[PDB]
């Protein structure tokens, strides 16, 4: 299987900002992209961004397209992601998914890891 | 030989007033002598740059364009709702014309989840001893999206036909639709029919499926 | 000069040149500048005098029919095209094109007339290309031997020799009168010698004398005087006027 | 002013050969010249050959050399182009243009373009439609709507022009891109979405034309459960 | 010209001619003679 982590998180204070960060090694990190996703608790999955190789700008969904920021860095396998003035909802579990689709336009979501956001 | 010409990126995607660049390239370099096209899908091509660095009549400033030699890009300096076409380069340093292979440029937006219908078959249909099933997926982005068959939840392959449309300019979304095909024997020799779809914006992969007598 | 697209010699194009300072060297010092031929002017001297006014004629032609473009000559480019004057002043310059202007078969962007109803005028244009009729049949279309077509191209190949090859040529015409100059060289302007004898040059008008303060009223748009004879009797200063 | 216009469409079947044609108007026929490209479904431009009706020069691309000839004529003010020995890929659009880079200034940049002519290779001829509705299911209906869609099949050559209740109703509309048989005959599929109180209580037909033969066609759509 | 002897393309007639007075007017432009066309050189100078 292919090995996954992240970083960061944690308690956060509302209307601040946060830094996110995963990262992987030992295998190909360019066929697949690097996405990222959310869970509330006890609740369905939403979608964050993704990066593609190219990396043409950025990717989102409609409630995380006007607050988030998504980097990539192939020549360290890591991927960073942003928050700005945090919400209410953001009191939730990320996750750190691949699109593993071999150089595709779409994906197939799977997710390796995933780490806690709490505005207290 | 024939010069032949290299347009690079072949895709694009990008929102209204986002600066977007596009590049086309020949095999030795050229004194110039290139122009760029812009044709809407099945409309006639119209003309935007004619020499290297120089704008057709009435074309809008927010087009631009520039280079010399082997390389040439060409510059957007705003996307617009209109811009959903395809550009081709056009080299004329010599008699055997080339056309470029063409950029196509589309509006990007957000996740859009499909939505997911299942058609099954006629009795009018029936009776010529065929029977096909249909499956669709409406108004989602991005582009494409996996449809996958399951009859008898058993995985099938290679008896379906699929078709696309452009982008919706209401919405900047997408649909596809798959056609599964089969003999009046083979259709009556399965019991049930699923399909079964996976997008970016859905939560888990979704199924639709009916039984024969329904 | 580096104007990527030149027209043909009929329909040639010009340029107004004014105010601004001429610098040749620029032109003459280049190796592929294959002919510089001036008439009433030596290309030495051209950094050092005065213009009123500059016309930058171009166009392209056959690498042996250049000899056509001169005072007074005679022929198809020399009638029907492109006349100069037979006093023309100015300077004729013309350089092989053929790596730019040439394809096998092809080049069928430069064009030329091969006769005309009378021959055109000094510095006279004809963008028309009407069908020319016998004048004995009324015509509204090409019919051979009579009802002609008159531009045809020269089709310049890669593969024709010297003498069919296509030559870049520019055509700059001078006007040597007296003051205003629009164009003059990059000679650097000294100070002001007054009632002294010294040797002076006021846009070109060299000579010497003791230069004194005029009292005879110029009008305005008087800028150089003359005595009996013709000679010079008073000059405007450029700098002050 | 100056335009260009093309024939309508034409087919015929593999192994013949196309004749086309573009009327040339407005100006002078003296000052025109004539190109020829193509577009075949879902890729880009191509270009065939060369014309001067005046100078008499032609010139045809390698890949078209002996196949294409290129002929025009100033009493009708028009040119016409023959391709022989067809193959199933010489499916495309035909584009002439006023012919360019030809003088002092004009560039080798096609400025003044026709309307278009496609033309179609296939072992099919000309023939009417088969069309039947589908049955959605009430089980598939989601946001308190239903999708309805009817399927237009085993007809030659195109266009096929499809509506709903006879253009009528528009929203929610959708169609899709047609499709060709291995058996030379196209087809066609649409849709149209509406609330699942709406149907029943209102009529919804879809309605079909084959225009190369004109054969009107039209019929009910019904869910059930 | 109206000798018509030609009866081939293969084996091209030419013939050469001296101390005559070429009448172009004539010559190659009656009635029959339906096209015309030349190359380099105008059809005035034929005359002159
Ligand atoms: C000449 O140019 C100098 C430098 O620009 C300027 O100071 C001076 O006023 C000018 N005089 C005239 C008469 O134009």
């Known amino acids: 299987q292919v090995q996954l982590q992240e970083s960061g998180g944690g308690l956060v204070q509302p209307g601040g900002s946060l830094r996110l960060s995963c990262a992987a090694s030992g295998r190909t990190i360019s066929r697949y992209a690097m996405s990222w996703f959310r869970q509330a608790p006890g609740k369905e999955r939403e979608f964050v961004a993704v990066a593609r190789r190219s990396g043409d700008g950025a990717f989102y969904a409609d409630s995380v397209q006007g607050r988030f920021t998504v980097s990539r860095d192939d020549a360290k396998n890591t991927v960073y992601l942003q928050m700005n003035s945090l919400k209410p909802e953001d009191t939730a579990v990320y996750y750190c998914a691949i699109d593993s689709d071999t150089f595709y336009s779409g994906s197939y979501d799977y997710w390796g890891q995933g780490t806690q956001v709490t505005v207290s | 030989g024939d010069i032949q010409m290299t347009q690079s990126p072949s895709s694009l995607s990008a929102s209204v007033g986002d600066r977007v660049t596009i590049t086309c390239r020949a095999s030795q370099g050229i004194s110039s002598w290139l122009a760029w096209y812009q044709q809407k899908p099945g409309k006639a091509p119209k003309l935007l740059i004619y020499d290297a660095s120089n704008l057709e009549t009435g074309v809008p400033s927010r087009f631009s364009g520039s280079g010399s030699g082997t390389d040439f890009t060409f510059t957007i300096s705003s996307l617009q709702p209109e811009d959903i076409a395809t550009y081709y380069c056009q080299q004329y340093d010599n008699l055997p014309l080339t056309f470029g292979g063409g950029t196509k440029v589309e509006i990007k937006r957000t996740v859009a989840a499909p939505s997911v219908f299942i058609f099954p078959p006629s009795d009018e249909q029936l009776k010529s001893g065929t029977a096909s099933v249909v499956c669709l997926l409406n108004n989602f982005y991005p582009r494409e999206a996996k449809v996958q068959w399951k009859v008898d939840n058993a995985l099938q392959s290679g008896n379906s036909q699929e078709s696309v449309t452009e982008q919706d300019s209401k919405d900047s979304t997408y649909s596809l639709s798959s056609t599964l095909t089969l003999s009046k024997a083979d259709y009556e020799k399965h019991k049930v029919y699923a399909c079964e779809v996976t997008h970016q914006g859905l939560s888990s992969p979704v199924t639709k499926s009916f039984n024969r007598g329904e | ?241 | ?225």
């Not at chain 3, 078969?105 to 510095?123: A, D, H, I, Q, V």
């Not at chain 4, 959708?174 to 149907?199: D, I, K, N, R």
């Open chain 4, 1 to 225: 002013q100056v335009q260009l216009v093309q024939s309508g469409a034409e087919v015929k079947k593999p192994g013949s050969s196309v004749k086309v044609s573009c009327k040339a108007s407005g100006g002078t026929f003296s000052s025109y010249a004539i190109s020829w490209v193509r577009q075949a479904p879902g890729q880009g431009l191509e270009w065939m050959g060369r014309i001067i009706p005046i100078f008499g020069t032609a010139n045809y691309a390698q890949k078209f050399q002996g196949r294409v000839t290129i002929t025009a004529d100033e009493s009708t003010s028009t040119a016409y182009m023959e391709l022989s020995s067809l193959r199933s890929e010489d499916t495309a659009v035909y584009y002439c243009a006023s012919l360019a880079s030809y003088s002092s200034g004009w560039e080798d940049v096609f400025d003044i373009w026709g309307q278009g002519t496609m033309v179609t290779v296939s072992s099919a001829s000309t023939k009417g439609p088969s069309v039947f509705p589908l049955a959605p299911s009430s089980k598939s209906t989601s946001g308190g709507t239903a999708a309805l869609g009817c399927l237009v099949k085993d007809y030659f050559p195109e266009p096929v022009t499809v509506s709903w209740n006879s253009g009528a109703l528009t929203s929610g509309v959708h169609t899709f891109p047609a499709v060709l048989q291995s058996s030379g005959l196209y087809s066609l599929s649409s849709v149209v979405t509406v609330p699942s109180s709406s149907l029943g209580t209102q009529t919804y037909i879809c309605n079909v034309n084959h225009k190369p033969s004109n054969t009107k066609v039209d019929k009910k759509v019904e869910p059930k459960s």
């Open chain 3, 1 to 241: 000069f580096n104007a990527t697209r030149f027209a043909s010699v009929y329909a040639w194009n010009r340029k107004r040149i004014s105010n601004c300072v001429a610098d040749y060297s620029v032109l003459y010092n280049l190796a592929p500048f294959f002919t510089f031929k001036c008439y009433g002017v030596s290309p030495t001297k051209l950094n050092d005098l005065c213009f009123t006014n500059v016309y930058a004629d171009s166009f392209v032609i056959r690498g042996d029919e250049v000899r056509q473009i001169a005072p007074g000559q005679t022929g198809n480019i020399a009638d029907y095209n492109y006349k100069l004057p037979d006093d023309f002043t100015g300077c004729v310059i013309a350089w092989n094109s053929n790596k730019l202007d040439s394809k096998v078969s092809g080049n069928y962007n430069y064009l030329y007339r091969l006769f005309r109803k009378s021959n055109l005028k000094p510095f006279e244009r004809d963008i028309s290309t009407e069908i020319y009729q016998a004048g004995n049949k009324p015509c509204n279309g090409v019919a051979g031997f009579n009802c002609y077509f008159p531009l045809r191209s020269y089709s310049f190949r890669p593969t024709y020799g010297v003498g069919h090859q296509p030559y870049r040529v520019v055509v700059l015409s001078f006007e040597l009168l007296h003051a205003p100059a629009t164009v003059c060289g990059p000679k650097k302007s000294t100070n002001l010698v007054k009632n002294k004898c010294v040797n002076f040059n006021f846009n070109g008008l060299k000579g010497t004398g003791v230069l004194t303060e005029s009292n005879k009223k110029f009008l305005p748009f008087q800028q150089f005087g003359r005595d009996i004879a013709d000679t010079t009797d008073a000059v405007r200063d450029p700098q002050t006027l």
